[PDB]
CSV table of C-alpha atoms and ligand atoms in Angstrom, one decimal:
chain,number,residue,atom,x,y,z
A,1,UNK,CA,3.8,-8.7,15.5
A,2,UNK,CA,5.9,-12.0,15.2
A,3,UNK,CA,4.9,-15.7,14.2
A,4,UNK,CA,6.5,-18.8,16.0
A,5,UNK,CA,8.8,-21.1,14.4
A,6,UNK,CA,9.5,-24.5,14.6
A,7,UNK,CA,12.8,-23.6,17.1
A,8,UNK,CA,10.5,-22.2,20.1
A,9,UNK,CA,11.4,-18.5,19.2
A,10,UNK,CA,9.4,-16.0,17.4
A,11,UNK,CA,10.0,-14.1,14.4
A,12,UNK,CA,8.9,-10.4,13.5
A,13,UNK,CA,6.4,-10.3,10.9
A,14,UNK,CA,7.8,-7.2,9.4
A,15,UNK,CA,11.5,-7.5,8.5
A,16,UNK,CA,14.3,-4.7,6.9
A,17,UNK,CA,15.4,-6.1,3.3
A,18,UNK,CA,19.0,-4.8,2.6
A,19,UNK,CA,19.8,-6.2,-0.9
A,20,UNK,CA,21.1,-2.7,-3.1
A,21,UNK,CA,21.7,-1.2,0.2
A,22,UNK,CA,24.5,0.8,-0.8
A,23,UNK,CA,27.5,1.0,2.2
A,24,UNK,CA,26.9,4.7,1.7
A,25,UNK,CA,23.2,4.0,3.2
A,26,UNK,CA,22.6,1.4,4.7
A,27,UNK,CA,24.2,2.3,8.3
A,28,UNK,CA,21.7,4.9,8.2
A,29,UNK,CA,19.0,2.8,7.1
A,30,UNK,CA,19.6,0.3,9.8
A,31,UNK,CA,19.5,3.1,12.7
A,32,UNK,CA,16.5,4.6,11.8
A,33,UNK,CA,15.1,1.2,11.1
A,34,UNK,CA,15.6,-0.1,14.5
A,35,UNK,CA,14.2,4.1,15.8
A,36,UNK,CA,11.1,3.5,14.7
A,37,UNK,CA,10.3,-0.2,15.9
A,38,UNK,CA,11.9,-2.7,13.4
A,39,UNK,CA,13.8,-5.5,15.4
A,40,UNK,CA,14.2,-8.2,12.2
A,41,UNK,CA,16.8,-7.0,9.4
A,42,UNK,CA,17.4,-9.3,6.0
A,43,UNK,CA,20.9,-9.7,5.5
A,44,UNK,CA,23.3,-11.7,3.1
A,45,UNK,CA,27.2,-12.1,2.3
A,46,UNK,CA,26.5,-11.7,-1.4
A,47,UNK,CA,24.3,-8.2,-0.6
A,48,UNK,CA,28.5,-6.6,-0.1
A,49,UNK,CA,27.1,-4.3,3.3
A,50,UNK,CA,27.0,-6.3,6.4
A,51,UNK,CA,29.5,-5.1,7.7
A,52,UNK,CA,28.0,-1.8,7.6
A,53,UNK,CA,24.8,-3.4,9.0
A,54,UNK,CA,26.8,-4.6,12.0
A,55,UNK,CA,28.1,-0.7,12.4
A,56,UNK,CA,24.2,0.6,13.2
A,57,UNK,CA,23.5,-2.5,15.3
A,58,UNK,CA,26.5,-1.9,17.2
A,59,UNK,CA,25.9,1.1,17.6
A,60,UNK,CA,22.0,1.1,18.8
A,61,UNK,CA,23.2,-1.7,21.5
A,62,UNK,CA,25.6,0.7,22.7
A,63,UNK,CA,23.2,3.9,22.9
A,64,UNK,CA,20.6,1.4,24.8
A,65,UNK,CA,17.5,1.7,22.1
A,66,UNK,CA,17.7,-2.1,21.5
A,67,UNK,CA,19.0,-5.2,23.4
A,68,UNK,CA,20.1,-8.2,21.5
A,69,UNK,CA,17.8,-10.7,22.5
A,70,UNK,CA,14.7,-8.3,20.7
A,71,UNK,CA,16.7,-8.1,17.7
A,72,UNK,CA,16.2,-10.9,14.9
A,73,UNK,CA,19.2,-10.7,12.3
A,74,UNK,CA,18.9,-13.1,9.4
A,75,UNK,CA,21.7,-13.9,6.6
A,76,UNK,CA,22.1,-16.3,4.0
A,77,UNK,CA,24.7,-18.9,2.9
A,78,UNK,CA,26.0,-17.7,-0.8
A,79,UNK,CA,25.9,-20.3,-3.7
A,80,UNK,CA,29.4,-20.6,-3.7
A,81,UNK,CA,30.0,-21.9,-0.3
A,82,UNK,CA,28.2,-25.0,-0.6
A,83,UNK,CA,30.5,-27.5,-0.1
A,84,UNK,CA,30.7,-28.7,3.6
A,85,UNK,CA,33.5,-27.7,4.2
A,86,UNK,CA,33.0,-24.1,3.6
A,87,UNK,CA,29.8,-23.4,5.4
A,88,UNK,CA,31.1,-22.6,9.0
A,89,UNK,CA,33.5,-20.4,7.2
A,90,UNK,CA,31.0,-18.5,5.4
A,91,UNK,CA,28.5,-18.4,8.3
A,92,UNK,CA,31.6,-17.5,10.6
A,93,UNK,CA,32.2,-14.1,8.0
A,94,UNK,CA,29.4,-13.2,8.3
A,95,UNK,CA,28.7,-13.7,12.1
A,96,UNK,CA,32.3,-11.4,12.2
A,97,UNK,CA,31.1,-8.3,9.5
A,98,UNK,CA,27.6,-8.1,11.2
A,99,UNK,CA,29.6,-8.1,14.9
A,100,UNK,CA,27.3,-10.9,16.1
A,101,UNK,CA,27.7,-13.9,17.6
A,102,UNK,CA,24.8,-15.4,16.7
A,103,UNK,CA,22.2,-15.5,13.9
A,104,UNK,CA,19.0,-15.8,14.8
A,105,UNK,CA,18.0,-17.2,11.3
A,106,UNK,CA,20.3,-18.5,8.5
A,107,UNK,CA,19.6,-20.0,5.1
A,108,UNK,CA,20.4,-21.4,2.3
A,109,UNK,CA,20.3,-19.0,0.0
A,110,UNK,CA,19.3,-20.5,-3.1
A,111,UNK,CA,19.3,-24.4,-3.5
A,112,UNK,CA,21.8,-23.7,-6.5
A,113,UNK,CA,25.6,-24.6,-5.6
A,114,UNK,CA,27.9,-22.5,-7.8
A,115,UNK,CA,31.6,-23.2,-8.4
A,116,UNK,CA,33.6,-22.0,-5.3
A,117,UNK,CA,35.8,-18.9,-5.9
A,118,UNK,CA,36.0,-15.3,-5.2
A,119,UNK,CA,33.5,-14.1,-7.8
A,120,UNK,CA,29.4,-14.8,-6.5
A,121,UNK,CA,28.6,-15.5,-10.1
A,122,UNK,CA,31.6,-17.4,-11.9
A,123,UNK,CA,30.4,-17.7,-15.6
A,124,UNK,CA,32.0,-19.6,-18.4
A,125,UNK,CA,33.8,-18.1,-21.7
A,126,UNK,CA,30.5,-17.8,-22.6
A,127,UNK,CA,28.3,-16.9,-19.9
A,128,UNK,CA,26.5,-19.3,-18.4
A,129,UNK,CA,26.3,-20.0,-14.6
A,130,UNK,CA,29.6,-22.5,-13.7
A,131,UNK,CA,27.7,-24.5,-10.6
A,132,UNK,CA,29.9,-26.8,-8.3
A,133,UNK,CA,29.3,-30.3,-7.9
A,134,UNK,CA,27.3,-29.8,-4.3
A,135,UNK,CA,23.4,-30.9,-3.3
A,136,UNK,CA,21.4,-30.0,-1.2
A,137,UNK,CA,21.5,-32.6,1.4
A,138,UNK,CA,24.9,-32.4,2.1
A,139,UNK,CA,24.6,-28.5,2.5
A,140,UNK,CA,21.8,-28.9,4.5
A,141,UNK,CA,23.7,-31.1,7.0
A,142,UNK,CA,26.4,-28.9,6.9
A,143,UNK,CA,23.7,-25.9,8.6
A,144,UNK,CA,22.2,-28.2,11.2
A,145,UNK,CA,25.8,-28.7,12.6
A,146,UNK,CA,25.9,-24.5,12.9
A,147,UNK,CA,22.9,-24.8,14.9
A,148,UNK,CA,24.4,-27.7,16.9
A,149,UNK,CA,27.4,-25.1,17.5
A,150,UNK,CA,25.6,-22.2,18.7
A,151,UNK,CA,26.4,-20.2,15.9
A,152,UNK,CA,22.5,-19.9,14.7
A,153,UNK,CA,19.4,-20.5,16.4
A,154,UNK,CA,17.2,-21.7,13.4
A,155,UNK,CA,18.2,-22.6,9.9
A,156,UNK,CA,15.9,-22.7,6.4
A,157,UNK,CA,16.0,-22.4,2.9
A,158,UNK,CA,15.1,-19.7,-0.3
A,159,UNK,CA,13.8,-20.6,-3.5
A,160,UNK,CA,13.3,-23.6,-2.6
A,161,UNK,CA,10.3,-25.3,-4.8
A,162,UNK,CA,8.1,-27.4,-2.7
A,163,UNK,CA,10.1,-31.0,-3.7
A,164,UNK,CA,13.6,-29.5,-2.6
A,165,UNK,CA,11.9,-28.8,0.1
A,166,UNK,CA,10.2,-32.0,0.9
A,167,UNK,CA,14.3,-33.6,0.0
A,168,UNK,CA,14.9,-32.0,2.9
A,169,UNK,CA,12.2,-33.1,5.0
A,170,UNK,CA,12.4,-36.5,3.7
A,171,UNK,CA,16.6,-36.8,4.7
A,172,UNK,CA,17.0,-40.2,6.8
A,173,UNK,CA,18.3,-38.6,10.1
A,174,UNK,CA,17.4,-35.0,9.4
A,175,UNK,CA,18.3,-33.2,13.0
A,176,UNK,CA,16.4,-29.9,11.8
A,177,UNK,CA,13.4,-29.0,9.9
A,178,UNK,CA,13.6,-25.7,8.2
A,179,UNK,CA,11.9,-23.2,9.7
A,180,UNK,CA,11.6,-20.8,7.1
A,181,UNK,CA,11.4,-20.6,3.3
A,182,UNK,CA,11.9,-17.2,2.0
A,183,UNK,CA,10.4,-16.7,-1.6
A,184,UNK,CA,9.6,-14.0,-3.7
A,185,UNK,CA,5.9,-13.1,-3.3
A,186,UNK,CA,3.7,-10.0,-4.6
A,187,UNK,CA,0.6,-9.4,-6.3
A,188,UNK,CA,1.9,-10.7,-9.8
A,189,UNK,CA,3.1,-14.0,-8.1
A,190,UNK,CA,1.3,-15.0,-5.5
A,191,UNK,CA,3.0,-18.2,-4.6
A,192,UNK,CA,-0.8,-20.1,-3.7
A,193,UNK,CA,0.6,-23.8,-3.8
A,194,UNK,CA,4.1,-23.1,-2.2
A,195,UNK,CA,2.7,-21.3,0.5
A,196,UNK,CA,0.1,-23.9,1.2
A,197,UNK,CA,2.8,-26.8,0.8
A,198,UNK,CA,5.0,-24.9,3.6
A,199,UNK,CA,2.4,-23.5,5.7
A,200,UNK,CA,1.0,-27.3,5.6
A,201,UNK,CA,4.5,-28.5,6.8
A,202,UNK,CA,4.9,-26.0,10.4
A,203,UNK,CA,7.6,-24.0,7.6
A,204,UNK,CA,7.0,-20.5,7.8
A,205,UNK,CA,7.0,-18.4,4.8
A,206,UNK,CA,9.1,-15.0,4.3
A,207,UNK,CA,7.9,-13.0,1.5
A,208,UNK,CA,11.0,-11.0,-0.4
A,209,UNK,CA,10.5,-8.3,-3.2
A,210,UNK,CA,7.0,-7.5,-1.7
A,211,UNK,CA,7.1,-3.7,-3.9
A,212,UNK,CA,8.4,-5.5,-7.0
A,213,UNK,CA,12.1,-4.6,-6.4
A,214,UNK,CA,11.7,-1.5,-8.7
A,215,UNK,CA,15.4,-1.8,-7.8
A,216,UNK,CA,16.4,-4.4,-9.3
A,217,UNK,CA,19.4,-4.0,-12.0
A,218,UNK,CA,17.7,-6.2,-14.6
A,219,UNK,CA,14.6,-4.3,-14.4
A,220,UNK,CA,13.2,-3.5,-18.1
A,221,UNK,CA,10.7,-0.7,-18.4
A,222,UNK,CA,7.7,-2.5,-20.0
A,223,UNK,CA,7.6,-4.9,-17.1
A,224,UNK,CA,4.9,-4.4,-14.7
A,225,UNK,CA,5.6,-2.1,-11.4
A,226,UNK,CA,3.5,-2.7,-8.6
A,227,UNK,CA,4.4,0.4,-7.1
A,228,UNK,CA,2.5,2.2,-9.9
A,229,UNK,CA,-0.1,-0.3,-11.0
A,230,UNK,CA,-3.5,1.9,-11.1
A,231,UNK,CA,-5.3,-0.5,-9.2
A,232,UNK,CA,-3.6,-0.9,-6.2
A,233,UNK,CA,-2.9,2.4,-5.6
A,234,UNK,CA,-6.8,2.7,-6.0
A,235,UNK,CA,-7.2,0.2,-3.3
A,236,UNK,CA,-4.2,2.3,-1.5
A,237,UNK,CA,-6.4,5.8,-1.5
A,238,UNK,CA,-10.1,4.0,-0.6
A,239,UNK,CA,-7.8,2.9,2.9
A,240,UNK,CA,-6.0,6.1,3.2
A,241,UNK,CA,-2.6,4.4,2.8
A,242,UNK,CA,0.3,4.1,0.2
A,243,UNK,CA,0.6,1.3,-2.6
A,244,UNK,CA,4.1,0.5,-0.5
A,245,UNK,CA,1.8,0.3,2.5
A,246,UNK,CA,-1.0,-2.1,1.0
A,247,UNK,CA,1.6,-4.3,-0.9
A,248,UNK,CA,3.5,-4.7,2.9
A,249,UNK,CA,0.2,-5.5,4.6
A,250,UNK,CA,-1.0,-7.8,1.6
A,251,UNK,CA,1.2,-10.8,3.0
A,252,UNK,CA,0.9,-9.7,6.1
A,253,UNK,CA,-2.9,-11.1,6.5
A,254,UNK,CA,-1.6,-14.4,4.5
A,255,UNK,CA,0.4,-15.3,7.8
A,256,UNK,CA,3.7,-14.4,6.1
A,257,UNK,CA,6.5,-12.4,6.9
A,258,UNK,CA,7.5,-10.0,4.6
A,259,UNK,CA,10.9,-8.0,4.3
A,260,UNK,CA,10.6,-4.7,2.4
A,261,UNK,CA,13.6,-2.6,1.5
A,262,UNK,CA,14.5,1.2,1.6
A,263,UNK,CA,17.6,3.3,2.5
A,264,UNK,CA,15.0,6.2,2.4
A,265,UNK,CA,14.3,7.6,6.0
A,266,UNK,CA,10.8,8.5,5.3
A,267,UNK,CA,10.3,5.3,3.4
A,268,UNK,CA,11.7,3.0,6.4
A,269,UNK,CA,9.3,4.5,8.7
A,270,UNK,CA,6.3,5.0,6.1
A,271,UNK,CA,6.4,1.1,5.8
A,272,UNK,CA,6.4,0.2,9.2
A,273,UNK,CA,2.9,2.1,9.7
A,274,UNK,CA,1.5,-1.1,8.6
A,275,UNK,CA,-0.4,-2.6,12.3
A,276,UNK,CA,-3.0,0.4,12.0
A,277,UNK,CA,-5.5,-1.0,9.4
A,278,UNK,CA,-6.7,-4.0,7.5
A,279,UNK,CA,-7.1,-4.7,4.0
A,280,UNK,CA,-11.1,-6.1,3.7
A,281,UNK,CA,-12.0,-9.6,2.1
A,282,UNK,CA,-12.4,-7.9,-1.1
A,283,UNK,CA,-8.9,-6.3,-1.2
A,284,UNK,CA,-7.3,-9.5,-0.2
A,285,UNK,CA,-9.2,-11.6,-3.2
A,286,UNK,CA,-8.8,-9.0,-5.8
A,287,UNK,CA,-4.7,-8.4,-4.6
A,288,UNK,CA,-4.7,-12.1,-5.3
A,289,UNK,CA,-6.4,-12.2,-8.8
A,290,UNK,CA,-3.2,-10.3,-10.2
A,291,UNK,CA,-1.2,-13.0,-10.5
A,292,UNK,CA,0.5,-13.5,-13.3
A,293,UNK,CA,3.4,-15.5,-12.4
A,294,UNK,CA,6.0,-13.0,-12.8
A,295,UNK,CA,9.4,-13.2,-11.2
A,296,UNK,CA,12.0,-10.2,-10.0
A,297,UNK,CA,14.5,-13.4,-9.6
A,298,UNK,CA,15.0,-15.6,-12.1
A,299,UNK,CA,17.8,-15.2,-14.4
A,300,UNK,CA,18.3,-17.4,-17.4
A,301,UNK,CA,21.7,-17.6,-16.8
A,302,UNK,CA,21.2,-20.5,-13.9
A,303,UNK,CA,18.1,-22.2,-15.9
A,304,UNK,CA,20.5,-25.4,-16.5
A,305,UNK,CA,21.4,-26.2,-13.0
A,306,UNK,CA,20.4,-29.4,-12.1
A,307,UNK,CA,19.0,-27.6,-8.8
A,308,UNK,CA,17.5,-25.0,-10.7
A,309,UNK,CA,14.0,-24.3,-8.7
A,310,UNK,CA,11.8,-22.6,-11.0
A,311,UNK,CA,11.4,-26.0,-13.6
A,312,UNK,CA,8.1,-27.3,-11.4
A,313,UNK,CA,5.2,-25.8,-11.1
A,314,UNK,CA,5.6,-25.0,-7.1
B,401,NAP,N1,16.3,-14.6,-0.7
B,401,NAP,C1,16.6,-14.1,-1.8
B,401,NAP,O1,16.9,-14.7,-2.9
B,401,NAP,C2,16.1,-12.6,-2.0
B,401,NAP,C3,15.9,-12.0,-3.3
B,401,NAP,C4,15.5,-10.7,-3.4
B,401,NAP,C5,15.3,-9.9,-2.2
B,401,NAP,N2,15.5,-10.6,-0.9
B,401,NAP,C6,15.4,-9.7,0.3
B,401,NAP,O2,14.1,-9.0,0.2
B,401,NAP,C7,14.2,-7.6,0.4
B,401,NAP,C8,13.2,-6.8,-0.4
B,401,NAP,O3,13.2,-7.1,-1.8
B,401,NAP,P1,13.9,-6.1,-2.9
B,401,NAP,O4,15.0,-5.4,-2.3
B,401,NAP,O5,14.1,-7.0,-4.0
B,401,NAP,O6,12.7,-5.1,-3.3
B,401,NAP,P2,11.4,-4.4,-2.6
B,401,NAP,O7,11.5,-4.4,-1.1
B,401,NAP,O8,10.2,-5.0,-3.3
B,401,NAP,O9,11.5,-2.9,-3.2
B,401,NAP,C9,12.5,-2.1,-2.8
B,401,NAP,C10,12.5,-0.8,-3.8
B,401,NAP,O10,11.3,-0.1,-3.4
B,401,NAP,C11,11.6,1.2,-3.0
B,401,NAP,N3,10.7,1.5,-1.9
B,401,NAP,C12,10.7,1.1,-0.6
B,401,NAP,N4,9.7,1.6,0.1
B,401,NAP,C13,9.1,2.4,-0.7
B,401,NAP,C14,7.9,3.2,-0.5
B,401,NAP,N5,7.3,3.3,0.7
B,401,NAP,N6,7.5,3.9,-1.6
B,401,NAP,C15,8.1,3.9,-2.8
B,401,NAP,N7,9.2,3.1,-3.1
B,401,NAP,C16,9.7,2.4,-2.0
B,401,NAP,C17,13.0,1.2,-2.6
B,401,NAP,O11,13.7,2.5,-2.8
B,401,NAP,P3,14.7,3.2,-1.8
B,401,NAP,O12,15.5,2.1,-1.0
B,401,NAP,O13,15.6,4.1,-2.7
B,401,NAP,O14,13.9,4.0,-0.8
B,401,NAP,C18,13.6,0.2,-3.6
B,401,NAP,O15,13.9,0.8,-4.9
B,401,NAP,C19,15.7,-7.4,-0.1
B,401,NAP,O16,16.3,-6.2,0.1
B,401,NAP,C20,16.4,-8.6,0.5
B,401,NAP,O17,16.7,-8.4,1.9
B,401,NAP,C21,15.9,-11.9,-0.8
B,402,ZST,O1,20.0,-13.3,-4.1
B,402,ZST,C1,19.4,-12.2,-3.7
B,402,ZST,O2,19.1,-12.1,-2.5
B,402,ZST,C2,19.1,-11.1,-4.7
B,402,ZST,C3,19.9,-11.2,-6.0
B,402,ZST,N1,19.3,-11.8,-7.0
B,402,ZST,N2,19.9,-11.9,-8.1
B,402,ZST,C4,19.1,-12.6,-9.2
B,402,ZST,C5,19.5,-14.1,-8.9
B,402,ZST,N3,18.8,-15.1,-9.3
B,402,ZST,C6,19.3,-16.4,-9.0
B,402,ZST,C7,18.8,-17.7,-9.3
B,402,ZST,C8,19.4,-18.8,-8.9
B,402,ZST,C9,18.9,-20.1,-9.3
B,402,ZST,F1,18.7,-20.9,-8.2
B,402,ZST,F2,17.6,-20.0,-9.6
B,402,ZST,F3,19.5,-20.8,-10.2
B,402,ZST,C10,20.6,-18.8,-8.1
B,402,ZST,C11,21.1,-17.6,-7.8
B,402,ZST,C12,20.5,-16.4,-8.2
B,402,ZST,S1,20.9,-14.7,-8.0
B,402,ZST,C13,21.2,-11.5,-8.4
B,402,ZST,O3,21.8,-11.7,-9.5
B,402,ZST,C14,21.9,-10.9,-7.3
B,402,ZST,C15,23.2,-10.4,-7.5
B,402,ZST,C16,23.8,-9.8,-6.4
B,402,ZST,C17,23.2,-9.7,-5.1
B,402,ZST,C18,21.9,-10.1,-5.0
B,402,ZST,C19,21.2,-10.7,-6.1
């Protein structure tokens, strides 16, 4: 049930997304999460509900169901908090709304550094993204000194491609190598070469938007739904298990960890009934042959960053 990082600690396999978690939810979400056995939960500053997230942690510590230590609470550092001198602050606000006081995994969010402000996504007169003169290297160095704080215990990176990765690696005096990269990954974009660049490296990979994100606000009915794609949910019924189900336990046997998102009860615990069968050979090449190198995130308004990650191939 969890995969060792590079820090000495493990990390469940199976993780809670929150992202369009709604305040109104995800309190609820979180408590029945952590009932029926999740101990990782995705979190993030931009997703506008930690705070509520801290409420059902707090409160399952209290009633004695969970003890810290078997929890694993990730967050991420928002694009416009980049700068160095920002970073604590941001990590530190979130730390405070989620009640914690530490993180057992934080990350950059995305490798883009946006102009720093109250609004997540300043955009010019005319819309396009307004990113702050930051890079990665110095934002990276900026996280190592939260680990060397105590704040978190391991730090990584999202949407990274595989050469902002190797940046990283490459840094004369890095102090910390990322332990995870968390990416989008599904059927329709199956990630081959970035996996096997960061699985070749000791990073572990985090699969995010593993149903497609049917959720997500952009979403344009004629693009593809996993959720409903006939032949998945014909691989789904030969196993006796939901598309949801096979699409959670598809990056599962790909040594990933994958964080799926509901606020629905039946859903949250549906999903985690996931350690109870195994997709065959077959499944696993045929999951794989879907790929069409379509992406949930990717928004054309950030496609002129000079850290935008989706240019290279991997
Ligand atoms: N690092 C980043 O840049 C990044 C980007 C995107 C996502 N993420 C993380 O990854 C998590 C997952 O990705 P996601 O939120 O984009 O989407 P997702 O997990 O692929 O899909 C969530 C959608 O699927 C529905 N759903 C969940 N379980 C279902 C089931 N068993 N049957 C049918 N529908 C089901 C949910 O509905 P209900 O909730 O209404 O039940 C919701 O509409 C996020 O919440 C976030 O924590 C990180
Ligand atoms: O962030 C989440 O977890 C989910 C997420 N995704 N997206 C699509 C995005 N696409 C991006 C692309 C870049 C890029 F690096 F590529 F330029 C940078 C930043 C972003 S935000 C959003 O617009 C968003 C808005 C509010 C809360 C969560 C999200």
């Amino acid at each position: 049930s969890r995969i060792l990082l590079n820090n000495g600690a493990k990390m469940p396999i199976l993780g809670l997304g929150t992202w369009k978690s709604p305040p109104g939810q995800v309190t609820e979400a979180v408590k029945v999460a952590i009932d029926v056995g999740y101990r990782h939960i995705d979190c993030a500053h931009v997703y506008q509900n930690e705070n509520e997230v801290g409420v059902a942690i707090q409160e399952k510590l209290r009633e004695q169901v969970v003890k810290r230590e078997e929890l694993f609470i990730v967050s991420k550092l928002w694009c416009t908090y980049h700068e160095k001198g920002l970073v604590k602050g941001a990590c530190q606000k979130t730390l405070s709304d989620l009640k914690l006081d530490y993180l057992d995994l934080y990350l950059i969010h995305w490798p883009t550094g946006f102009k720093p402000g109250k609004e997540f996504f300043p955009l010019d007169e005319s819309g396009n993204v307004v990113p702050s003169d930051t890079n990665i290297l110095d934002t990276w160095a900026a996280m190592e000194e939260l680990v060397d704080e105590g704040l978190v215990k391991a730090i990584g990176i999202s949407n990274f491609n595989h050469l902002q990765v190797e940046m990283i690696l490459n840094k004369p005096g890095l102090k910390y190598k990322p332990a995870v990269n968390q990416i989008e990954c599904h059927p329709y974009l199956t990630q081959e070469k970035l996996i096997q660049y960061c699985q070749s490296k000791g990073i572990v990979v985090t699969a995010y938007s593993p149903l497609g994100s049917p959720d997500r606000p952009w979403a344009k009915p004629e693009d593809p739904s996993l959720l409903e794609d006939p032949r998945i949910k014909a691989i789904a019924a030969k196993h006796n298990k939901t598309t949801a189900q096979v699409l959670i336990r598809f990056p599962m046997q790909r040594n990933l960890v994958v964080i799926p998102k509901s606020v629905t009860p039946e859903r949250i615990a549906e999903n985690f009934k996931v350690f109870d069968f195994e997709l065959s050979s077959q499944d696993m090449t045929t999951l794989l042959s879907y790929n069409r190198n379509w992406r949930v995130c990717a928004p054309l308004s950030c496609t002129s960053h000079k850290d935008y990650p989706f240019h290279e191939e991997f």
